[PDB]
Coordinates of C-alpha atoms and ligand atoms in Angstrom, one line a residue:
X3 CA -6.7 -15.3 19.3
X4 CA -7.7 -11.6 17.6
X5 CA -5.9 -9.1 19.0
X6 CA -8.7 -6.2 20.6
X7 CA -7.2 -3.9 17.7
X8 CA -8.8 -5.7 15.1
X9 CA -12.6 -5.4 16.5
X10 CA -15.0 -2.5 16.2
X11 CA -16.7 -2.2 19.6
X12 CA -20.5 -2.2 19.4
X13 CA -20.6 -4.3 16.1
X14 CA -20.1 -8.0 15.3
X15 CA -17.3 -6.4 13.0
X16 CA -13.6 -7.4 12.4
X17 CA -11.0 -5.5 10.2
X18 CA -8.1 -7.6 8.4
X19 CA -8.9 -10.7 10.9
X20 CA -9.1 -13.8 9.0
X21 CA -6.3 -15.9 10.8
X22 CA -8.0 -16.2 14.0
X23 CA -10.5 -19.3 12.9
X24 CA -14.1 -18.1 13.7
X25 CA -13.5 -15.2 15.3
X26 CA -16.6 -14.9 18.5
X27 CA -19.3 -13.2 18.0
X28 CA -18.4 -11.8 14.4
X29 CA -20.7 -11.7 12.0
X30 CA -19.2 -9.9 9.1
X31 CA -15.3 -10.1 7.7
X32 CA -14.0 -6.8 6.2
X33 CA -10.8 -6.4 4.6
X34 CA -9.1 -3.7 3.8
X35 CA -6.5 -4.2 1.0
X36 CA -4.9 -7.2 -0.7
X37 CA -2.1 -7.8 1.0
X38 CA -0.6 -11.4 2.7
X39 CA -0.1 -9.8 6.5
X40 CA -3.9 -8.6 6.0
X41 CA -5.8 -11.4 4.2
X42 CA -3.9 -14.1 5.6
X43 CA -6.4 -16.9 6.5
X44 CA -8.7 -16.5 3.2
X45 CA -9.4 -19.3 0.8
X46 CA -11.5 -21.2 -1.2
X47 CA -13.0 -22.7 1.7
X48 CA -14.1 -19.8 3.5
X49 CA -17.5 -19.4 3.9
X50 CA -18.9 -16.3 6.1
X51 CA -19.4 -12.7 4.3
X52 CA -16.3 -10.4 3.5
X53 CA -16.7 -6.9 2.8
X54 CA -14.3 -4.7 0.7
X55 CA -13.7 -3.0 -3.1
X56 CA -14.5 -3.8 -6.1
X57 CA -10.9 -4.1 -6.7
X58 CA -10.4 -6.3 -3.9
X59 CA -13.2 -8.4 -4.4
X60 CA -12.0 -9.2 -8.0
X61 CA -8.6 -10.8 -6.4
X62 CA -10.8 -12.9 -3.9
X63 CA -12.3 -14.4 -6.9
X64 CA -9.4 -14.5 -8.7
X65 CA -6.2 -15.3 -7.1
X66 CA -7.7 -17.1 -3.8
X67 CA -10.8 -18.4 -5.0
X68 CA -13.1 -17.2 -2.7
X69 CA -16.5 -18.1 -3.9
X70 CA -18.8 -15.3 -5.5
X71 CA -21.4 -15.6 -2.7
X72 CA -19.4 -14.7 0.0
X73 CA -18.1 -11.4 -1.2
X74 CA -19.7 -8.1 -0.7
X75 CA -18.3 -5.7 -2.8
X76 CA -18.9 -2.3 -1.8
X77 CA -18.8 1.1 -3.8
X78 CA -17.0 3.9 -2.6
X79 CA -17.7 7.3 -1.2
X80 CA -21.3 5.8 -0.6
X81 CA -22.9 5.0 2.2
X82 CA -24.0 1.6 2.9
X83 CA -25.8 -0.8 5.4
X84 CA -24.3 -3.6 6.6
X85 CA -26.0 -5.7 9.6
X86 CA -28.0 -2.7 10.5
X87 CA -24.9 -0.5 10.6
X88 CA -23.9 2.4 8.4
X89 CA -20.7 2.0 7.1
X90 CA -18.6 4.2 4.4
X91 CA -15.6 2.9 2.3
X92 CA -13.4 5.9 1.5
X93 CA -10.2 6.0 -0.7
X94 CA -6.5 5.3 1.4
X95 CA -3.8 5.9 -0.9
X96 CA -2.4 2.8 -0.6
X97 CA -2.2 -0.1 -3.1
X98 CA -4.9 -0.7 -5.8
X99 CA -8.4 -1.5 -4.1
X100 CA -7.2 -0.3 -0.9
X101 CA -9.6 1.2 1.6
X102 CA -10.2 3.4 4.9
X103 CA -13.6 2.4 6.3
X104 CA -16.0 4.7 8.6
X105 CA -18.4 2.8 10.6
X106 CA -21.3 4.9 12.3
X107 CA -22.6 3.0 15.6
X108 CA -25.9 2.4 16.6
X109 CA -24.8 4.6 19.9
X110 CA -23.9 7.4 18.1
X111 CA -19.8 6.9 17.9
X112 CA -18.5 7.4 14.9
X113 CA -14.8 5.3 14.1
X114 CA -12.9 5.6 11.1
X115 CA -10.0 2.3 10.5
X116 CA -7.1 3.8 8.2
X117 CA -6.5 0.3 7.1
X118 CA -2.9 0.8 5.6
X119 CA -3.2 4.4 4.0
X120 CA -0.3 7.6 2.9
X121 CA -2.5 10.7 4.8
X122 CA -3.0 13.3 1.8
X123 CA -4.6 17.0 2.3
X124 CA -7.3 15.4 -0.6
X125 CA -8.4 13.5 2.2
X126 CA -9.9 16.6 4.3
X127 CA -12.5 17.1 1.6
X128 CA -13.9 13.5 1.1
X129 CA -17.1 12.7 3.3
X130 CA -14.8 13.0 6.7
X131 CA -15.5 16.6 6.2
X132 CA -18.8 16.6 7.9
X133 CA -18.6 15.2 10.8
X134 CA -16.8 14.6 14.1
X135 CA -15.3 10.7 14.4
X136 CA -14.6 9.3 18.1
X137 CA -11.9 6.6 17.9
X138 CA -9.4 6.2 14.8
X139 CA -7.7 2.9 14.5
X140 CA -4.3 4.3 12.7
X141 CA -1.8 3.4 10.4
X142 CA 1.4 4.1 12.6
X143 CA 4.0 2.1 10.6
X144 CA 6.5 5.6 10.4
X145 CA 5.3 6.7 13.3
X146 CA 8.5 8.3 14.0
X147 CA 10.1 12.0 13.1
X148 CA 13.3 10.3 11.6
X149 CA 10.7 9.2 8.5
X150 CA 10.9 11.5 5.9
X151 CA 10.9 10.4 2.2
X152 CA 10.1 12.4 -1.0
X153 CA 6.6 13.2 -2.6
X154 CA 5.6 9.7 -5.3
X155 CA 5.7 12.6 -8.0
X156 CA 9.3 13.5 -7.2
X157 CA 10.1 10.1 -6.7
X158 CA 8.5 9.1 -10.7
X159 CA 10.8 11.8 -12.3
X160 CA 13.7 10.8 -11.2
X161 CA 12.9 7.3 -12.1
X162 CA 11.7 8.3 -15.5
X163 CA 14.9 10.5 -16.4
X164 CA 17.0 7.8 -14.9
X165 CA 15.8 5.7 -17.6
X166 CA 15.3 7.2 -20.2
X167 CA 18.7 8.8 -20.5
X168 CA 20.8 5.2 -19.9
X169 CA 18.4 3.7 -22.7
X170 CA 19.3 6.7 -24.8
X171 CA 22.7 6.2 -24.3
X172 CA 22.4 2.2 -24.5
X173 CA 19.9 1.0 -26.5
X174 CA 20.6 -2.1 -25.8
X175 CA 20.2 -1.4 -22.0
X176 CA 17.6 -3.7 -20.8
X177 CA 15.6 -2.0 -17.5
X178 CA 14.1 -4.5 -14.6
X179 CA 12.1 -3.4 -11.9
X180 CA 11.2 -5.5 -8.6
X181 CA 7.6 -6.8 -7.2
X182 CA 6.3 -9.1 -4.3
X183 CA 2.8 -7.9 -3.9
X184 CA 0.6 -5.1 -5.5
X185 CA 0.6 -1.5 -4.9
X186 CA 3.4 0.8 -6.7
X187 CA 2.7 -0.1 -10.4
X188 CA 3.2 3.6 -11.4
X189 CA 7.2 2.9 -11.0
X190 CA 7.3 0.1 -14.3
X191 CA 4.2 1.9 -15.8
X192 CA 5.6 5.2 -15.9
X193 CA 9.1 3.9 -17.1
X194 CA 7.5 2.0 -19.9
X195 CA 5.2 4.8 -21.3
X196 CA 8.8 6.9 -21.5
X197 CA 10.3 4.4 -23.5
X198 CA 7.5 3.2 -25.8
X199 CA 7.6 -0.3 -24.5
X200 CA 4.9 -2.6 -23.0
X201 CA 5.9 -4.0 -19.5
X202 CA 6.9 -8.0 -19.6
X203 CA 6.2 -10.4 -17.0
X204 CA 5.2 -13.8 -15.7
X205 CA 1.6 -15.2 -16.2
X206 CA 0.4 -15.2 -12.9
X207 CA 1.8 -11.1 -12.4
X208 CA -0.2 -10.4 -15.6
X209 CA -3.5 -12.4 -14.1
X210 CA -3.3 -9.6 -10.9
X211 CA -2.6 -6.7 -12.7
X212 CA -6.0 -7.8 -15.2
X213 CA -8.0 -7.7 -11.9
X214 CA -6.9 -4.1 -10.9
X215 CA -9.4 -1.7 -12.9
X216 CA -6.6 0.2 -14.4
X217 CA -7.8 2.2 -17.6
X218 CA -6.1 1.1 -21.0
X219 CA -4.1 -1.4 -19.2
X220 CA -4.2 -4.0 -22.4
X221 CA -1.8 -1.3 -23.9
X222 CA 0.7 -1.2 -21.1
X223 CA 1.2 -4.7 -20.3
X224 CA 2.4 -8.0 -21.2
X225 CA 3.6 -11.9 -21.2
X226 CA 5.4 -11.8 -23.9
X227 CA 9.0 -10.7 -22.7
X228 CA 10.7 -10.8 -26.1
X229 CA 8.9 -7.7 -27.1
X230 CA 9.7 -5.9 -24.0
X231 CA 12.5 -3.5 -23.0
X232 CA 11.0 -3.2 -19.4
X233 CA 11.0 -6.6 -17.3
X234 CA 9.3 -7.4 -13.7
X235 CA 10.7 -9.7 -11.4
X236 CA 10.4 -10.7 -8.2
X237 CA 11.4 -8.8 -5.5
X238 CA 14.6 -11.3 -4.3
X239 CA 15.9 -12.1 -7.7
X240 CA 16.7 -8.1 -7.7
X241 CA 20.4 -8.7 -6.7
X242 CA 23.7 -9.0 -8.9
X243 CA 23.6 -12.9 -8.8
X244 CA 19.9 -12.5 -10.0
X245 CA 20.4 -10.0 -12.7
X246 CA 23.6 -11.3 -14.4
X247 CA 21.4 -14.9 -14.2
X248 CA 17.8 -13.1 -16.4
X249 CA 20.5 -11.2 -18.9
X250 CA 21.7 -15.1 -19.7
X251 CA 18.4 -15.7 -20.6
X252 CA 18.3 -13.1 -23.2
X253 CA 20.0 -13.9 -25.6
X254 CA 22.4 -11.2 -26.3
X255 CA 19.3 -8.8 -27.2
X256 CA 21.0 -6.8 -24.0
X257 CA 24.3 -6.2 -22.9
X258 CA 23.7 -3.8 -20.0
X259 CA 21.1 -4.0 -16.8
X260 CA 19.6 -0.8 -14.9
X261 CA 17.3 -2.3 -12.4
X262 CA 15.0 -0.8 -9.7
X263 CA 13.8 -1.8 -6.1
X264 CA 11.1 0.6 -4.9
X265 CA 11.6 0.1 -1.0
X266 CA 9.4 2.2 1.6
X267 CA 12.1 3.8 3.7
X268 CA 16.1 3.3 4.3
X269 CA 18.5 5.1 6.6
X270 CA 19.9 7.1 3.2
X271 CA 16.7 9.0 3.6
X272 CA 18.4 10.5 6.8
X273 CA 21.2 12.1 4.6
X274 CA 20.7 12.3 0.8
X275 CA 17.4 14.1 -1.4
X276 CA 16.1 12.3 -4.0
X277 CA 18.5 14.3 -6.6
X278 CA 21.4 13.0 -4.8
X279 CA 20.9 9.1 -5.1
X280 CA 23.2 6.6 -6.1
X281 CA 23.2 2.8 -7.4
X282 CA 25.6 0.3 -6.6
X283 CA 27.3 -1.1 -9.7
X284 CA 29.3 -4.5 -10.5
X285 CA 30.1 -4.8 -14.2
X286 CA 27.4 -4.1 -16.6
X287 CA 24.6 -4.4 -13.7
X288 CA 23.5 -1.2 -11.7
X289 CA 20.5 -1.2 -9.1
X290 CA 18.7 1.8 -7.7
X291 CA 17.0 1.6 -4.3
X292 CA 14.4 4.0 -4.6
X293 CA 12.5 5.6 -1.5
X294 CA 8.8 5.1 -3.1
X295 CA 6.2 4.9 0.2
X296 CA 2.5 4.0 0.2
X297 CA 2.4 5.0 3.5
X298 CA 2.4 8.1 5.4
X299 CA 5.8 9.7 6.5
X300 CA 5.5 11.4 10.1
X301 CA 4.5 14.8 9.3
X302 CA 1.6 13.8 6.5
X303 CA 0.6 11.8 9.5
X304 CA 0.8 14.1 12.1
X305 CA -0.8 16.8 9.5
X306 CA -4.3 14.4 9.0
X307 CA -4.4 13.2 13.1
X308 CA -4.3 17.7 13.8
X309 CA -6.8 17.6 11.1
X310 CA -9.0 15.0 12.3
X311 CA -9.0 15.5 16.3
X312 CA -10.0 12.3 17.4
X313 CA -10.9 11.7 21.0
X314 CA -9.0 8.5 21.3
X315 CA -6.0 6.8 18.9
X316 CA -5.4 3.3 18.3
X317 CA -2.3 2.0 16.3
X318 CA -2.7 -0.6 14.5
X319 CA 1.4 -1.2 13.6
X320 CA 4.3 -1.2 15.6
X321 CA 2.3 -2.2 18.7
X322 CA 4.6 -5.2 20.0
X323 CA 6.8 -3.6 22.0
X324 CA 6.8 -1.5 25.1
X325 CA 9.2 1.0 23.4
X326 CA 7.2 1.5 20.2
X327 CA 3.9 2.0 22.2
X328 CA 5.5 4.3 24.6
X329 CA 6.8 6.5 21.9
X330 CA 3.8 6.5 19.9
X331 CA 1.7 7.4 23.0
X332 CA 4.3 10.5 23.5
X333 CA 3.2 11.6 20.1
X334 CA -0.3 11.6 20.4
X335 CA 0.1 13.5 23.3
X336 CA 2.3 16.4 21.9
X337 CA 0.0 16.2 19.2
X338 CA -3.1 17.0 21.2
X339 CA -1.4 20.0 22.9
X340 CA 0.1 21.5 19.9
X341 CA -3.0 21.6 18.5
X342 CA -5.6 22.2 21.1
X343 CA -7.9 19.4 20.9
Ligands
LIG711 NI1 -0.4 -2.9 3.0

């Protein structure tokens, strides 16, 4: 059964809802980003309307086969009418095709759903700017002062320089960065452009990054790994046993790995900055963990909530355990009273 988190009072709406069965009562599906936690339930055989991107809409089609009829893409930064309501898709900083949606109520409430989303100043000149909003349903995954990570800029140059001087050094280096879903392409894009290589990877990777709307993407990307010095693999074959296993495949074109795993957060953040990081080495492979979020730390959280001053918060992660709720709830609060609201 849908937990009371997913629904939007005073609508037949849902957000990120479609593992439920036929959810009572709702009459329109939206989804917020492409990712399996959030569109879990969709198929082929669904058949009642989903709202979402452009983007999204494009891997409905594509990769789950959704039929054409039932998906409503939406523009962005425009407002809409959907089953008599007023509804506003607005940019989340998230993955590609991922979206915050404002929904203004026949009543007069006005609710804004985060979906997934890294809070950004940007974000206090989009249309939230003019007006007040009620309720926000909020994207609490680092909902915790301990999470702290560097900027995605700061984050890109030390990946870049990383790479770029062990190629230098090694030509015959070969570098391999780790995927399981969309979102963070700008870690293998940027380290590619540096090197004057196309990315390489499987068929079916290629087939989601070609639904994505990314400009001059043809140029940047490929299936043919032979004619790459960049590789993508799956996210669990980033490991020693998985590395020394694709440099077997090669051929002896490489003789040397450097590999990336662009995690969200790790306990290192507690200690080291960015300049400071370290891989773990065995032989000729070496692996970077590096702290690249697409969500909000703490304080770019607390920053848009003081920002915002919502009347009433509801998280949408971490909420399965007394302890989590409880601390959340303590933040709100000190929140509130730091800022006046
Ligand atoms: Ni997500």
């Amino acid at each position: 059964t849908c937990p009371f988190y997913k629904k939007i009072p005073g609508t037949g709406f849902t957000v990120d809802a479609f593992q439920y069965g036929v959810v009572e009562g709702c009459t329109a599906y939206f989804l917020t980003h492409f990712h399996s936690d959030h569109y879990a339930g969709l198929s082929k055989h669904f058949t009642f309307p989903v709202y979402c991107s452009e983007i999204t809409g494009n891997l409905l089609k594509n990769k789950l086969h959704v039929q054409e009829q039932y998906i409503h893409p939406l523009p962005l930064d425009t407002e809409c009418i959907v089953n008599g309501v007023k509804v506003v898709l607005l940019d989340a900083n998230h993955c590609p095709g991922a979206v915050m949606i404002l929904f203004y109520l026949p009543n007069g409430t006005v609710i804004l759903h985060t979906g997934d989303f890294r809070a950004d100043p940007s974000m206090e000149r989009s249309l939230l700017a003019d007006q007040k909003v009620h309720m926000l349903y909020l994207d609490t995954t680092y909902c915790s002062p301990e999470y702290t990570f560097p900027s995605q800029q700061e984050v890109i140059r030390f990946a870049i320089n990383t790479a770029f001087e062990a190629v230098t050094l090694n030509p015959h280096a070969l570098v391999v960065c780790g995927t399981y879903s969309i979102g963070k392409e700008k870690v293998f894009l940027a380290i590619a452009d540096v090197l004057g290589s196309k990315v390489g990877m499987s068929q079916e990777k290629y087939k989601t990054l070609q639904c994505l709307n990314i400009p001059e993407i043809n140029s940047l990307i490929t299936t043919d790994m032979c004619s790459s010095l960049v590789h993508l693999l799956p996210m669990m074959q980033i490991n020693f046993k998985g590395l020394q296993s694709h440099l077997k495949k090669c051929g002896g074109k490489y003789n040397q790995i450097l590999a990336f795993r662009p995690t969200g957060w790790t306990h290192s953040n507690k200690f080291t900055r960015i300049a400071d990081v370290i891989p773990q080495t065995k032989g000729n492979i070496s692996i970077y963990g590096i702290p690249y979020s697409e969500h909000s730390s703490y304080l770019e959280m607390k920053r848009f909530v003081q920002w915002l001053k919502p009347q009433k918060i509801i998280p949408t992660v971490n909420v399965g355990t007394w302890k989590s709720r409880s601390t959340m709830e303590k933040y709100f609060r000190e929140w509130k009273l730091e800022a006046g609201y």
